């Protein structure tokens, strides 16, 4: 075709180095962090990862903000549906707007 900009930059002595960590290693780190915070709660960031059920971790996280834990256990389907709708709206927000 024609002369590219990057070929001119390479021919004039300007070189772009590649990063040390690939995208696959970044994705592996992100997946490990997600799995740790999903299964073990916050205990994996302070030593050994201690497993817990997720509803009981959710009860602790409501307890930390000042709401008693019986609010979650009596309404757990509503928190589940609200979380599902909230994480589903991020998909429709990111699939259309590019700003």
């Amino acid at each position: 075709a024609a002369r590219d900009l990057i070929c001119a930059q390479k021919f004039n002595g300007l070189t772009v180095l590649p990063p040390l960590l690939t995208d696959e290693m970044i994705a592996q780190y992100t997946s490990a962090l997600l799995a740790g915070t999903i299964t073990s709660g916050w205990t994996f960031g302070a030593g050994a990862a201690l497993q817990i059920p997720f509803a009981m971790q959710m009860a602790y996280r409501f307890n930390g903000i000042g709401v008693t834990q019986n609010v979650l256990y009596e309404n757990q389907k509503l928190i589940a549906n609200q979380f599902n709708s909230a994480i589903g709206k991020i998909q429709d927000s990111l699939s259309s707007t590019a700003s």
């Binding site: 302070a46 030593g47 050994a48 059920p53 009981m56 009860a59 256990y73």
Partner: protein, 105 residues
Amino acid sequence: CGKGYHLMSFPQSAPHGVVFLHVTYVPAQEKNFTTAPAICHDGKAHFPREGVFVSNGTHWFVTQRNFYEPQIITTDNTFVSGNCDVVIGIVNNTVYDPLQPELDS
């Protein structure tokens, strides 16, 4: 302030800088357990005040989260909210009332 659960920190001097000695709390030896979110006793649902419900295989105990010391499930360390047909995963266990034997004398 360091890695772990923070307790203190001790500053130290250095050439062109400062050195901190963070003191932290690290849990060491864990063992695995069976747990339930709540206790159905006498048609009422019991939730712990602080801590967690654990089972050693036969009985049900209450203990704190960051350490393992088992205690008997009591009315003093539990509170009642609703009936045992809404909470998912509720089990059956007796609840000790300290007021009844002090009444019966």
